[PDB]
């Protein structure tokens, strides 16, 4: 789940506070603290976000010709459900036998 967590982090950081902090210093026309931090987050953060996006884009790219990157694709998980059904029917039959026994005694 490494790639999933990376994509989630990239999505959470896409709408970062940089896009909202570009309208903070312009309102501060009465006092000039660490206001310089409102300058370094103008384009460097966007540049890093774009670099990370391009890096994530340049992944393995499994899909080339047909339908690769499988992984469920397969066996008796179905028959495992059927085995659970067997368990349920055995439960039903045992309950019926117990009811028959109770009726007989």
């Amino acid at each position: 789940n490494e790639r999933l967590r990376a994509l989630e982090d990239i999505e959470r950081e896409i709408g970062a506070i940089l896009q909202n902090a570009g309208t903070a210093i312009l309102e501060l026309s009465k006092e000039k603290r660490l206001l310089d931090r409102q300058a370094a987050a103008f384009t460097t953060s966007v540049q890093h976000v774009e670099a990370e996006l391009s890096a994530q884009i340049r992944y393995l790219t499994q899909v080339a010709t047909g339908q690769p990157h499988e992984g469920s694709s397969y066996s008796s998980r179905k028959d495992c459900q059927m085995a659970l059904k067997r368990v349920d029917y055995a439960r039903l039959k045992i309950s019926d036998v117990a009811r028959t026994c109770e009726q007989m005694l």
């Binding site: 067997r86 055995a90 036998v97 028959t100 007989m104 005694l105």
Partner: protein, 46 residues
């Protein structure tokens, strides 16, 4: 056999035992049939 020349309680107990065997076999039948339960299903049983 030949030479060419009280049982109320007994019958009651006999009828009681016969009914007991009847209900016993009735209780048997179910588990008797469902006894195998894996025989037809050995193809995937372990």
């Amino acid at each position: 056999e030949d030479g060419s020349k009280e049982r109320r309680e007994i019958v009651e107990v006999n009828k009681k035992l016969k009914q007991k065997n009847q209900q016993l076999k009735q209780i048997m039948d179910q588990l008797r049939n469902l006894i195998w339960d894996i025989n037809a299903m050995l193809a995937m049983r372990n």
